[PDB]
Design a protein around this ligand. Structure first.
Ligand SMILES: Cc1ccc(O)c(O)c1
Ligand SMILES: Cc1ccc(O)c(O)c1
Ligand SMILES: Cc1ccc(O)c(O)c1
Ligand SMILES: Cc1ccc(O)c(O)c1
Ligand SMILES: Cc1ccc(O)c(O)c1
Ligand SMILES: Cc1ccc(O)c(O)c1
Ligand SMILES: Cc1ccc(O)c(O)c1
Ligand SMILES: Cc1ccc(O)c(O)c1
Ligand SMILES: Cc1ccc(O)c(O)c1
Ligand SMILES: Cc1ccc(O)c(O)c1
Ligand SMILES: Cc1ccc(O)c(O)c1
Ligand SMILES: Cc1ccc(O)c(O)c1
Ligand SMILES: Cc1ccc(O)c(O)c1
Ligand SMILES: Cc1ccc(O)c(O)c1
Ligand SMILES: Cc1ccc(O)c(O)c1
Ligand SMILES: Cc1ccc(O)c(O)c1
Ligand SMILES: Cc1ccc(O)c(O)c1
Ligand SMILES: Cc1ccc(O)c(O)c1
Ligand SMILES: Cc1ccc(O)c(O)c1
Ligand SMILES: Cc1ccc(O)c(O)c1
Ligand SMILES: Cc1ccc(O)c(O)c1
Ligand SMILES: Cc1ccc(O)c(O)c1
Ligand SMILES: Cc1ccc(O)c(O)c1
Ligand SMILES: Cc1ccc(O)c(O)c1
Ligand SMILES: Cc1ccc(O)c(O)c1
Ligand SMILES: Cc1ccc(O)c(O)c1
Ligand SMILES: Cc1ccc(O)c(O)c1
Ligand SMILES: Cc1ccc(O)c(O)c1
Ligand SMILES: Cc1ccc(O)c(O)c1
Ligand SMILES: Cc1ccc(O)c(O)c1
Ligand SMILES: [Fe+2]
Ligand SMILES: [Fe+2]
Ligand SMILES: [Fe+2]
Ligand SMILES: [Fe+2]
Ligand SMILES: [Fe+2]
Ligand SMILES: [Mg+2]
Ligand SMILES: [Mg+2]
Ligand SMILES: [Mg+2]
Ligand SMILES: [Mg+2]
Ligand SMILES: [Mg+2]
Lengths: 299, 299, 299, 299, 299
């Protein structure tokens, strides 16, 4: 059955490109690639030409998520599936596909308004191995798991679930978290490969499309050094170190120059098709810096 | 689903059979088998009776590619599939099948005019283990991967892709290579088993059906010795040693007595169903000898 | 898809039960189980209550082959498949099923006239571990591979193939063996599990239903001792020690007291779905004693 | 502790070099190497320049056994050990060492009169991989196990044992075999590496220094084919196929053109330091052709 | 027994430090570390503070080899062993040890005049992971194998062998290579850990202490890219790509800015204690650029 197989790339727009270059390299160990374009640069994690496009003169938010399918037959099948179900899509011409450096490209929006791209045939620069922006003990976990995961804004969880399910994702409510005001927040997490989740959401108020992006190190030492960099440089940590009940990953959440959060992590477990839920994390992920997309403790 | 499972055998015709015997044995380590026929001999690589038929009084080009299916049910299913799709096929009688030493045989041509045979039931001489034409450290990689791969001539890539897809192959454009004249050459690569590719093509001008045949050694030492044989004997090397971005194989391309190229290699990676593309090889495969099927550098 | 999964049991009839008890125990290492019945006894190989039923006052030939399916749903599906295709079957009542010690039983004949039973739910005596009729270094290869294999008589190979294919077997002509008279004998071999073949046949003249039964030792030492027993006791060996091209097993063929052959063996390879053929065995299996079901050399 | 580590090479002399070339290649699969010397040629089994030197104008017997030590320090230590114990040795000059193609060489005789050489630094031709004299499924077992083993003549087992023990071998009486005349033959077997034995002997009357040489195939198929070659060509088999109780190897013993026996085999077990004994082999090794070094059955 | 366990560090002096920084980073992928010292900088390969010290205002040759022992007890034992055998050593004070960044240090010269240091307790910067001077697919092989190997000048091979044997190395003559003038060059290779050799030499005329330094990549792709860098930048290659008979490594030899050779390589085999010799390499290592420390082909 035709399905999305990974979060292949994403685009963000920023107001301060120079701050983003220093942040990405020094704080995270990502590689900056500048192709001489006036309005954008790239961040690499592996052999792909890029994983993140960073657009200038921007909004400090997500621009697009790029979801990969295996090839042209799955691209065509999924496109027709979306059309048959009543979703509005546009099949892109050669110029637009070349902009993203993919062989085939279609554009749509998810039910929450998040620009969503489906593509086949990423550009891989095997001649240009990843070279991190600071020394690293290891590298990033990508491969069959794609670049990482995001929590994005939604207005109707059922509608969002319908859309991502059509795309081949699996998952449902995995957390029922008590809120300070007596309500219970339901968070849904969906997978499309071995990464425990690639997309997640609730129907929570949010000023930005993007709540956080999670990037995963192969080595615990790089995660620890990254955490220390945030502390040393007095960068806000919204949720402190902890371990998630679903994916078993060791992570924290820190501010980016755009105000949405980065979640550096290590040791994510394999996705499971069998739905379960929790009322909190294993421990940690307590609130430190207030006033971010995540103001409430997870355990 | 019924599908081609390997490149089982191939036939070539040559103007100089004696030169071909010395080339195949000394330069490559293939085994010559002469069954006393006036007009042909065989080259072996493994337990199969043969992998290559070498016809005399010839054209210095490919005569046929022989694609294996698992058995009679898949043979019949694929035959009917070709007929239903409007392709012209001929089901061969016992005499023609016996000529190829197979249990069932059908003949057609691919959209580029390359004679294409589909068969089941190869003859295996378990009593006669491979005995290479020169001493070898190892042997050849065949088995589930078939004999090797070819690049062949096509006039319409989309039509070629349709035909091979019907036969059960998977793959698409994997290289977009800049050409000296400012154009971009698109090369497509298709697999039917664990070998990264078994057939590949672009819509490129070509005097011969066959651009090159790739044969894979189990041992790096045999590849190195083969490379040294080409250098020592001053045989043209069209593309020097390098590593492909798609299959990760260490290979070079040298002249055969027929003028098309042999690509001896080592360390091919497992095929992947997920389409990606590159703008060049990892490195190497630079042009040395000019005037062959490949005049342009691959990295 | 519903299919036969193993040769579960078989029945033979004999004129000399006492000779058969001594032969089975001393020459082969099978276990004799006598349940006090006037007209039969059993031979064991493993935890099954039995693998071979030996009927008295007999014909020195095969009485029935018992083919297992996984359970009742597959039994019912296969029964209906046979009926729909025009084959005559009888679904057995409780008394007949109890005679065979199975939970469900149907009876038919293959196109060559060989009585064929299909059943589910064999009786396993876990409380009664196999105890061989002579000391053994090892045991027998059974399990997922069933008891062994037989070559049986057929009058029309295509009809036989159709029947066994309906039952879920796979396989075709694997040998084209030159005969002394200038003809070529075609032998077909079919599998229904990991055993390289469980049933095989050609359209060859035969006085008996059963040409041979093959039983496989886990240990080479037991095969060698068995071979030595045949030599020491001057029991006819029709085909001497050799190795088959298809299953790679080390075997010989010796006379039983019933005149059909036993093929003791060791080291059978895993079945393959990809059809190939040979013109002889790896070596050995030359003719020694003449006048048996196999009078012609296999290599 | 300084010790012999393998049977590295051996020398034989023959009356019929041409018969020996055909025998070694066709019957055994050894590689003939002729360096243009008037009086000798070589047999190869692996990457070593050679394992067996075949001298012309000879006696149809063993000329020397060449025992390897790890290096110069062990060579010197063992030389001094032999001198201290009262054995007569000669340290060879450069010319004599070069004849054997070794870096250091000493010559002596064992207590039975068998010329015995101790050396370090064999010549290995890594550029020249083994190329068998007939097609082989596999190759030979050499490496840490050396070339094979011999039974040689002795007049005093205790004296022989003392000598080989000084050289670093371990082992003792492993067989007490009943003889037709009512006596019991004691055979001793000694190891110096993982090969179950490299040298063995009893105090038995013998016209030749060499009773037999055992060579081990990696693949059972090559052993079987070799056995079939002896049968087909009507070459005397002194002891038929069987399995040894000590090393668990499948072997037979056949005549060479020199009248002493070759023991082709397969599946030798790892040497053990713990002494045990047997009164016969597992089975087989019965007498067929009479009048050879071995006239008595082993089981 | 106390012994040297690896080539831990080395010092070189150069006339052109800027050329060396560009060469080391771009051509080899080494990491430049400048600690602000006026007269030296460092090259890193791994977590060690450094592996190579590069001194300014120099002689374009080796300054010292630094051989590690396990700890203080082995340092003291080896020091006393050298004194007892009549070698001149100096035990260094704290200032000299701190210069090398080691816990204990002694200085001597080998019999060929090559400055030789023995130390315990290297400085490891676990906080500062290796960051190569160009992007790399992999990293370097160091660890238990130390930094690499050198061939250095000697005037008396027996004396050199005595010295290195006292230090705990093992090895002897491994090559007897025919020279153009009819002589035979003997080369000796010694190991002190799993690296096939760490030091090697003959008694050959040489203008420099250092003939070559070998550095080993984990990944074949980095070796290939390095080879391509030498070709592209028209840097002299003295011996072309080939494989050594002793260590089985794929290597070539290229000019450094100091005129002695670097030998980049991949796939070195484990050292063996059993001495063997060869008359050439497996193949390759033919002469290209003349006028370097190696003017003669190795195969
Ligand atoms: C900000 C921006 C710039 C270019 C694009 O193609 C896009 O999608 C967004
Ligand atoms: C919500 C939104 C609107 C426009 C943008 O360019 C963007 O990144 C986000
Ligand atoms: C907890 C949360 C915060 C912001 C979001 O956009 C979301 O989907 C969930
Ligand atoms: C649950 C799961 C695990 C691994 C996968 O590759 C996948 O698609 C789903
Ligand atoms: C592994 C670990 C250690 C300390 C923490 O506070 C935590 O959340 C996790
Ligand atoms: C509650 C939760 C679980 C896993 C995540 O990756 C995350 O961001 C939040
Ligand atoms: C040249 C040639 C000869 C015989 C054939 O069967 C064939 O296909 C081609
Ligand atoms: C193009 C072509 C035509 C005829 C042949 O026999 C051949 O090998 C090729
Ligand atoms: C690059 C190339 C050259 C010749 C061909 O026939 C082809 O398909 C591709
Ligand atoms: C991609 C792939 C890998 C292995 C196979 O056997 C196959 O058919 C396809
Ligand atoms: C492994 C390797 C070594 C050298 C080369 O030039 C190359 O292309 C590959
Ligand atoms: C560009 C390319 C990649 C892989 C191949 O086998 C080949 O011949 C060419
Ligand atoms: C001879 C015989 C006896 C009983 C049976 O049930 C049978 O099938 C055959
Ligand atoms: C052919 C045949 C007929 C009756 C039997 O009982 C039997 O075993 C065989
Ligand atoms: C060779 C052979 C002999 C007897 C048979 O019944 C058969 O099917 C095949
Ligand atoms: C070819 C094959 C191998 C194993 C099996 O279990 C089977 O049913 C078929
Ligand atoms: C393993 C083996 C040994 C001897 C033989 O004759 C044979 O056929 C097989
Ligand atoms: C020719 C052949 C192959 C395999 C067998 O089991 C057999 O009985 C015969
Ligand atoms: C017969 C013979 C010839 C030369 C030798 O060196 C030797 O030991 C024996
Ligand atoms: C006993 C004996 C004597 C001389 C030889 O040359 C020989 O090979 C054997
Ligand atoms: C049994 C035997 C035969 C000959 C010998 O030389 C020997 O040592 C033992
Ligand atoms: C008994 C034994 C086993 C292995 C060896 O390497 C050895 O020297 C001894
Ligand atoms: C494995 C084997 C088979 C038959 C024999 O006679 C023997 O000795 C060994
Ligand atoms: C009795 C015996 C055991 C092992 C051998 O190798 C042999 O030649 C004899
Ligand atoms: C050239 C140089 C400079 C400082 C040192 O300590 C040394 O050994 C060499
Ligand atoms: C031979 C030599 C002399 C002095 C040095 O500083 C040096 O590096 C080498
Ligand atoms: C072959 C060679 C060249 C230079 C040296 O210093 C050496 O020891 C060996
Ligand atoms: C020969 C060898 C192999 C590994 C080692 O660690 C060593 O010291 C020696
Ligand atoms: C692996 C390899 C390939 C080509 C060569 O020339 C060589 O020496 C080694
Ligand atoms: C002849 C040789 C072998 C191995 C080496 O590392 C080397 O430099 C030279
Ligand atoms: Fe997250
Ligand atoms: Fe190719
Ligand atoms: Fe059989
Ligand atoms: Fe023996
Ligand atoms: Fe070297
Ligand atoms: Mg989940
Ligand atoms: Mg592909
Ligand atoms: Mg089969
Ligand atoms: Mg023993
Ligand atoms: Mg060595």
């Amino acid at each position: 059955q035709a399905a999305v197989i990974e979060l292949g790339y994403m685009g963000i727009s920023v107001k301060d490109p120079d701050a983003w270059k220093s942040f990405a390299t020094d704080m995270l160990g990502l590689q900056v690639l500048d192709e001489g374009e006036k309005d954008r640069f790239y961040l690499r994690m592996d052999y792909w030409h890029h994983r993140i496009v960073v657009h200038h003169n921007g909004q400090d938010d997500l621009e697009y998520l790029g979801w990969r399918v295996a090839g042209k037959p799955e691209f065509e099948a999924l496109g027709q599936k979306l059309i048959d179900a009543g979703y509005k899509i546009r099949i892109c011409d050669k110029v637009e596909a070349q902009e993203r450096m993919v062989l085939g490209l279609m554009k749509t929006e998810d039910p929450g308004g998040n620009p969503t791209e489906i593509f086949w045939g990423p550009r891989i620069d095997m001649s240009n191995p990843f070279h991190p922006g600071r020394p690293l003990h290891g590298k990033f976990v990508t491969g069959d798991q794609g670049l990482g995961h995001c929590i994005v804004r939604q207005t109707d969880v059922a509608e969002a679930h319908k859309f991502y399910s059509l795309l081949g994702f699996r998952g449902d409510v995995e957390y029922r978290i008590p809120l300070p005001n007596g309500m219970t927040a339901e968070l849904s997490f969906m997978h499309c490969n071995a990464r425990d989740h690639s997309i997640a959401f609730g129907a929570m108020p949010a000023a930005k499309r993007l709540n956080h992006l999670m990037l995963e190190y192969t080595h615990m030492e790089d995660l620890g050094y990254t955490h220390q960099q945030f502390v040393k440089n007095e960068i806000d940590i919204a949720l402190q170190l902890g371990i998630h009940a679903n994916d078993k990953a060791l992570t924290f959440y820190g501010a980016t120059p755009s105000g949405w959060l980065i979640e550096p992590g290590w040791r994510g477990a394999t996705a499971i098709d069998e739905a379960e839920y929790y009322v909190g994390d294993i421990f940690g992920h307590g609130v430190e810096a207030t006033g971010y997309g995540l103001d409430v403790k997870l355990s």
